[PDB]
Design a protein around this nucleic acid. Structure first.
Ligand SMILES: *[C@@H]1O[C@H](CO)[C@@H](O[C@@H]2O[C@H](CO)[C@@H](O)[C@H](O)[C@H]2NC(C)=O)[C@H](O)[C@H]1NC(C)=O
Ligand code: NAG
Length: 173
RNA sequence: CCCCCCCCCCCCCCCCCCCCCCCCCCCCCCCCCCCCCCCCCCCCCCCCCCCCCCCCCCCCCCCCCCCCCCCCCCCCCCCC
């Protein structure tokens, strides 16, 4: 796992997050591994991560406290996992996120408000899920959102109310 | 009891590209052989023509000699 300013762990057969890395590491790439979970305790040492690419692993669920240990996290990639369920507290503490990638997670539906808390989010990706609607919330949030990816889902119609949460959003894509 | 999503490794097949290796064809150059045409040099051959030399033949010319025939002239002697 060679790392001078960015840490990469691609195809390293890793099952748990390594605990021997420089403290000032800002980028942690853990793609194509066997990470079952991402406990917050394993990320206590890393308090300066900006981008955490954990996609192409076997994560089934996360914990909100993980975002507590990463106050400066900007890019969070959860591509190709099985996080089929989300909660309103899942992304509450991740208030400085810019990119949130959730492609190919077999998510079936969005319940109440998983993205209300974050306000600086720029792009939200939800492609290759089982979503049958564009409903992502109830109130108006995602003020600064510019890109919304909803490709390869089960959406069959577009309704005005389902998009009402983007009243103050200038969707560039 | 039953699905789906990731990881490594092993493959199979179809394309692309790069390697050596070889084949066939072609090009460039050189060499060799053969054929055709042409030039140059030297030694000759045959024929024709011109000239020259030697020898010979025939004819003719000039001169000379010999013989024959013919003519003229001189001496001398007889006959009637
Ligand atoms: C973390 O590393 C992975 C693997 O290198 C990156 O994912 C993809 O890697 C493949 C193979 O090198 C590339 O062909 C893709 O282009 C990469 N994806 C993208 C979106 O470029 C992954 O991007 C890395 N993550 C970060 C945050 O750098
Ligand atoms: C955000 O949306 C609300 C409700 O529509 C509106 O009152 C408010 O003016 C919007 N904000 C901006 C900056 O336009």
């Amino acid at each position: 796992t060679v790392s001078h300013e960015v840490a990469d762990c691609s195809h390293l057969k890793l099952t748990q997050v390594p605990d021997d890395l420089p403290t000032n590491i800002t980028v942690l790439n853990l793609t194509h591994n066997q990470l079952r979970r991402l406990p917050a305790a394993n990320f206590t040492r890393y308090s300066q991560l900006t981008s955490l690419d954990v996609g192409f692993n076997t994560i089934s669920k996360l914990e909100p406290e993980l975002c507590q240990k990463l106050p400066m996290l900007k890019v969070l990639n959860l591509q190709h996992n099985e996080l089929s369920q989300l909660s309103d507290k899942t992304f509450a503490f991740c208030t400085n996120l810019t990119e949130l990638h959730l492609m190919s997670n077999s998510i079936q539906k969005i319940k109440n408000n998983p993205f209300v808390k974050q306000k600086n989010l720029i792009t939200l990706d939800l492609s290759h899920n089982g979503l049958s609607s564009t409903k992502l919330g109830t109130q108006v949030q995602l003020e600064n959102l510019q890109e919304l990816l909803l490709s390869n889902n089960k959406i069959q119609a577009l309704k005005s109310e389902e998009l009402d949460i983007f009243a103050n959003s200038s969707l560039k894509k």
